[PDB]
Symmetry: C3
């Protein structure tokens, strides 16, 4: 007790799981007592073979059984799960459920306008996936090909990824916010032979350009042989390059309503998803087929307490890992309907999220902390109008949750009845690492609680590189052994995959996050230790933004850091130095330069112009100074007078 | 009793199964009583899962077992059988039998001249198929490729289709009668990467040109990379385009006598077979692998009463669905020798069919009604010379059988000892739909008796579109649910497949045939309701013939209909109107224009030339008038005087 | 007794298996008594299905089980084993052992210099094979592709063949001694899409050129898309053609440490290996996957008495069948470490072979008789310095072993404690045919003893073509039925495969060797009957050397034969006749002409020049005369005076 190192633990008492939730369970809970979970967790770490074997056979339908549950080491980067097994993601997500209950809802597609909303049953999802998959096969997509997807968060993207996996190909979903240059690089890296996109998207009542950005990047993408285009708005003046572009509706009507699924090996690539790390250009994270689906199945069934009668709503976009796991695979593997929203929580009214939960009587809701802050400041009153009584579990993902936000979440939406589960994980983790299991774990506000099955959490001292033992401790967060849903490599570049995750601390998986552990065992996440800032959930490497600013001929050097913006969580500020008029206009010109190389979400909130940057004698720009200058101004540098200049221009600009 | 609507049922008494047949059975009959069959049939309709499951495991050797017997609906066009199963057609047709009895006869190849006849054992068929398959594999044929076959009805074609299926490819047999333009269209549609043909064919003592027609179409077929040519006559002056054409004997000698078969999914395409429907160009009918072979195995074993000691003779050509199912797959699946005839029933003498039955002591004989009429008028006396005592079952296929022909069949050939089984089915049906089961069902002459296992027959009123209930009823014939051997789609054009079979009467499979059902339950087929005429067994769309006539610049409009010709069953007459001398010569010039675009069997018997066609005010040519004018002349038209002109020119011409 | 025909059997007594060996067995011997072996052998011949079935399931890990143990006949050339089975060679050789004992040694790589020696564990071999296999897959290598290997006898070649088989591709190892023209022909025949080689090799302290010879042949090899180059010496001035050549270290670092193995059918090609027969250019011998690995597993486990605790040293190069079977697959299948030597038994000292046996405490040693003669004449004394006490079994392979050499082997190296096993077999045989089983069979010096499991040995009279029955008999050696590891065909040329092995004596496998059988049943090999001479183990067709000499414009005709050279066993002499000065220099010019078309090992020891060759009236060069002229001069020819000229020039030259 009386924590000294973990200051956040002090003054925090366990918020017991509300009693109303256990009554709203449609069936007996998967786990009875919290002591039962600790016994399950202890087995997954000590005996991984005896723990995950049965669960894999229970939750996955195998075309061919595996001979070995776990192989490989973190140090050697040769991890593998369920070796010898053969299965298919589209059979487990669609086919098997469509045979039992064809008319059961599968995709509840809620569009930007509710007039364009519709529901697809599992029988319908099987027919549409088979048809789309039939088109890609006639085009020549085979096992081992990568197929790119540039679609908004609607049912069409869900259908696309399943049809690609159905053939044994790997899908690479590119976020619709990205620019043309970001599509160019990502496609060329994967050597995609096909692209699935739409004519244009509609979000918040505005018509976003989609196909036009694809045509721009595709002139520099020679691997793409053919492109599939969906008529989301049916705009007549949308050009389609002959021989390359073909129409979704026209081609799918040519092929039958059932296509045989292609068996893939357990360690065969399921998908690629590009993320930006502290150093280097965005890398292509690869996930295996079997170990990923299992991880998604476990975390969904047990942490969220998902039963066959439940309905899940996950707000995240499929362009990021959250939509991948807990808007598609997780729910569909368990045979429950998932809610896919193509709009924003503000259009038409700020209660749009809550109409959907009322309309479809959703039982589980998954949201990012950046959206809860937006709703509180803007549309807090609308919540009471809608029912929201069907919700049993409220989740949080992507950003640190504040105790202030946690209490607002519990009563304003859950009415002190729902269970709150702060789910900490990563794109590379595939599934949840640390989260409160609903009905089991009493959550401490702000803490992600205990680690999940198969995750052996530990802290490491950053300087000495030793594992810290005990409680009331702080350090770098790392995992001792690999787990089923762990990412297996970076596409065509395993060396950077080792240099990033396995080599910083050999024998450990490097998460890039600082954490603390209290005496109760609950884990507190303190943010990323490398040069990555979480801006509205999007991870952004400072180096990617800095390289975009330097593309302008005038920019001699640039440096970007992050600070706490209330709405966005973190915002990147740009301190740029020019070589040798209209200073305010050039600042805006740099903002679109970042918006052109990367996308609109990378644009800095402000750009401060200084002649000299705070540098050490060797040359390293003192990012610690620029960080504090943004907030509070209170070591050895080259010129200290330059610091007064940076403070002068910061107030002048921001 | 006392049928009013079904006039054919009146005056017809059951012709009981002859007692001599049961004694000639080499073993106990598959079905004991007719009540046993009705119980089997009732199960196949009520419980399809419990009926076809065991039969599939019994009659098919699976590389991998299936998880679901039946999926999909007619309304959605997503039918599938034995989902998850893996198997290969060449293993079930050749390999497994060759292991048990290598020296057992498999292909009894009876050529145009008996001096060129030979027998291939199952061990020989395994070696020749493996070698041919070895050539196609080195050429690059893989699972999912289509391979065209343009061969006469000999052992080489049988070997070809097995070698193609062995690799998992799909074979498209093109009838040797077709012209070059028909090969052109069919090949381009399937995008065949290879072609198997012969130098030239010999039929009825005449040397038919084969390779030369292939070279003509192949200049407009870019997908064909290589061609395999068999030396049927070894004509020295047969050109072989270098890089494309290679020799059957030369290449097969390069590869070993065993090649591993490639596993295909149950719903993977087995073959394509092009047929002409009332509307549109000829379409590519697709059949699955597993559901087709089962249907062929069931219909052969039970309707024909085929036992391991039996020998089957089916006269049909492999260019049509009859040779596909009951000259190749059906017999070979059950491990019995099949008789392949490359000649005609007239050369050398009209008793050639009966020498073969005597020579090889055939037990089952399958023939079309168009051949029975030819033999009766020309060579009726030769039958008594040959033994023909080994025959147990006589079959009829393709055309309506007349009660006059049925009685001639029973005594002149069967000697009132064989069982006659009128087998009604379709290219799309894959296997028999309605037929008398030998040893079980007493056949009514002219009636195809009761429907077969898994076929839920029903009649629909054409106008109201309602299912007719009761007996003494007539209407459109339709099947309530799909069946294993049902065709799954039209190649690369599922929309026309729905528009033709599933959309005319939703929830039903449209057969395109009129039928009647008497009080005993026996079904009577009354012919096709759409614009298709059965000329000597070949289904011919009127629109395909009309489009060929219109290719001549002079032809303004044309219209073709059918009437009863004794020899051909039905003959198509052509009424053509020219724009603006040698009228008799231009009539002959049009006949070869049809023979050039389609083939020799489409040529009209006569061509009547009129200036105006009987038309409604909207423009539809009154095909009912041209139909009656051909036979007996006894509504609102545009000009009635034109009718007197059509009658005047009909007598003048025909 | 008192053998008359088998003169070698007379005066020979059984040398009983030394008692010390049974004590040095780490476990109970696989076979207890010699009578037990005869009962096992009798079953393998009478009931092949009941004998090899269990052994295949015991010694091989199957991805899918087979349905038939044995099919096909020698006469039809359609042999097949374990039909229907699916497996992978790299799983059985690496993966399965790496799971049980990752840190167990697998490849003990002893380089030309011991400073460059290293050991790879089974876990390491799994990671390196997976990475290399990962590179070939991204390059596009798939099941059915051939990949060429031009590497010396080191660990890199072993890794290469496993990675190729891992993908289901077939590897074609080309011996590093061969010239550029020999690589050209071999690659073009197989149509290899990739090549794995190294910058240069080091052997006996000399730097051999390797990559440079590849670049020379690759300009005439269009099928090769990409090439993998290993940095054996890291010579900076090694050119790498851009787009074609890539670096082993650079590419393998890009791919992960585990790659899923690809299932292949039992009869799918494992590898190709080119050998030269009496007639024709070198042919590509093909071996199946399953039947080969089993044969290698049986012969290694039982003839050599290999147990899990044993260590094997086989001196042969992987460029020939010996390194294939008993330096790679045989040991690795059984999960024991194998010793790979990149040097020669003379460098640094003649006791290098024996340091390795002492260093790694090797228990089994495999050597060719040509090396035992070299060591005896040059470095006999070094043997006593090293321990060599861990050896239990000494083997002999490739050449006839002399009784003089057999006794030297037994005491000078084995110290009358090891068991000597003369293993006679062929490239086409895949595994041992006739050999003494250690611990079971008392070996007669010079005799290979009894045939092995599944080999039904018999002798045939060369003239009459009848099988000789009884003992004290001599004739052509042939095998009555095929066996699992028998070669299945010649690549893309099955006709020559039949003409060579199955057609000379139908119903028998032609070995090309003369043999004798004594009253005890022991077999004595008397050499090859066709025009093939074993020069230092390399089989060399006389026709291949003769064609190389004739390439020079001056050479009108040439004829080469073989005689007994002490060091090389057999040496080829060249008698060449020119069309029309510096006679000694042209003789040397011809020697390099052979060294350029074939390789350095084909160069004749001497070249005798004569104007006329001893010829029959039809024209056949009397090779019997040139054979005797070389040794002792003691029929009807065209000119007898030419014989005096050949004798005159032989003494003048050689
Ligand atoms: C999985 C969401 C999308 O993942 P990304 O790969 O884009 O970003 C992962 C990072 O988000 C933060 N993070 C994620 N979840 C939480 C969380 N629940 N609490 C605090 N920080 C969190 C942690 O810093 C982590 O390293
Ligand atoms: C299966 C033979 C070749 O089939 P096709 O696809 O070429 O033609 C099918 C049509 O032939 C007629 N037909 C077929 N068999 C009979 C039959 N036994 N009696 C009467 N009409 C028949 C029916 O009209 C049917 O729609
Ligand atoms: C397997 C070694 C490499 O094989 P190759 O395919 O290069 O050569 C096979 C031939 O070598 C001889 N031969 C092989 N082993 C022996 C042996 N043990 N004794 C005598 N001659 C032998 C026999 O003549 C045989 O036909
Ligand atoms: Na399989």
């Amino acid at each position: 007790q009386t924590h000294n190192v973990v200051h956040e633990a002090n003054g925090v008492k366990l918020r017991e799981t509300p009693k109303e939730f256990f009554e709203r369970q449609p069936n007996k809970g998967h786990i009875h007592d919290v002591n039962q979970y600790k016994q399950m967790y202890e087995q997954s770490i000590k005996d991984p073979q005896g723990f995950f074997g049965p669960l894999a056979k229970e939750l996955l339908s195998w075309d061919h059984d595996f001979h070995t549950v776990k192989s490989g080491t973190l140090k050697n980067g040769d991890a593998a799960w369920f070796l010898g097994g053969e299965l298919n993601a589209s059979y487990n997500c669609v086919d098997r459920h469509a045979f039992a209950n064809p008319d059961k809802p599968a995709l509840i597609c809620e569009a930007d306008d509710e007039k364009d909303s519709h529901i697809l049953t599992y029988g319908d999802l099987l027919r549409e996936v088979s048809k789309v998959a039939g088109v890609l096969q006639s085009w020549g997509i085979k096992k081992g090909d990568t197929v790119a997807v540039y679609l908004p968060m609607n049912a069409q993207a869900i259908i696309a990824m399943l049809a690609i996996a159905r053939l044994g190909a790997a899908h690479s979903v590119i976020f619709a916010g990205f620019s043309a240059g970001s599509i160019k690089d990502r496609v060329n890296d994967a050597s995609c032979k096909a692209l699935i996109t739409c004519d244009e998207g509609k979000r918040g009542g505005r018509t976003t350009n989609i196909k036009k950005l694809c045509d721009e990047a595709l002139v520099d993408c020679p691997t793409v042989e053919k492109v599939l285009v969906y008529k989301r708005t049916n705009n007549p003046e949308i050009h389609l390059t002959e021989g390359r572009d073909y129409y979704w509706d026209v081609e799918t009507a040519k092929f039958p309503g059932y296509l045989p699924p292609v068996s893939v090996n357990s360690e065969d690539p399921l998908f690629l998803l590009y993320t930006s790390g502290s150093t280097g250009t965005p890398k292509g994270v690869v996930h295996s087929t079997a170990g990923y689906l299992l991880g998604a199945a476990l975390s969904t069934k047990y942490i969220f307490d998902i039963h066959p009668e439940d309905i899940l709503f996950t707000a995240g976009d499929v362009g990021w890992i959250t939509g991948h796991t807990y808007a598609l695979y997780g729910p569909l593997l368990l045979g429950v309907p998932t809610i896919i929203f193509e709009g924003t929580p503000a259009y038409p009214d700020y209660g749009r999220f809550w109409q959907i939960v009322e309309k479809h009587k959703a039982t589980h809701f998954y949201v990012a902390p950046t959206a809860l802050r937006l709703l509180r400041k803007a549309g807090e009153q609308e919540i009471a109008k809608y029912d929201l009584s069907s919700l049993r579990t409220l989740g949080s993902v992507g950003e640190p949750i504040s105790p202030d936000i946690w209490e607002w979440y519990n009563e304003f939406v859950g009415k002190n009845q729902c269970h709150i589960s702060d789910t900490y994980w990563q794109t590379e983790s595939g599934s949840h690492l640390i989260a409160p299991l609903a009905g089991v774990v009493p959550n401490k506000p702000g803490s992600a609680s205990y680690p999940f099955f198969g995750i052996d959490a530990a802290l490491i001292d950053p300087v000495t590189g030793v594992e810290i033992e005990g409680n009331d401790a702080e350090g770098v967060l790392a995992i001792k052994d690999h787990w089923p849903s762990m990412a297996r490599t970076v596409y065509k570049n395993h060396t950077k995959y080792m240099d990033t995750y396995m080599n910083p601390y050999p024998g450990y998986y490097f998460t890039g996050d600082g954490a603390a552990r209290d005496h109760d065992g609950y884990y507190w996440i303190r943010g990323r230790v490398d040069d990555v800032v979480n801006v509205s959930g999007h991870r952004l490497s400072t180096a990617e933004i800095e390289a975009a600013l330097i593309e302008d001929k005038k920019v001699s050097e640039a440096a970007v850091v992050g600070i706490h913006d209330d709405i966005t969580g973190q915002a990147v500020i740009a301190y740029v130095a020019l070589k040798e008029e209209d200073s305010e206009g050039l600042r805006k010109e740099l903002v679109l330069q970042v918006r052109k190389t990367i996308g609109p979400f990378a644009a800095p909130k402000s750009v401060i112009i200084v002649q000299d940057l705070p540098k050490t004698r060797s040359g390293k720009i003192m990012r610690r100074i620029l960080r504090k200058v943004s907030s509070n101004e209170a070591s050895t540098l080259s010129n200290p007078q330059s610091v007064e200049g940076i403070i002068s221009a910061f107030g002048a600009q921001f």
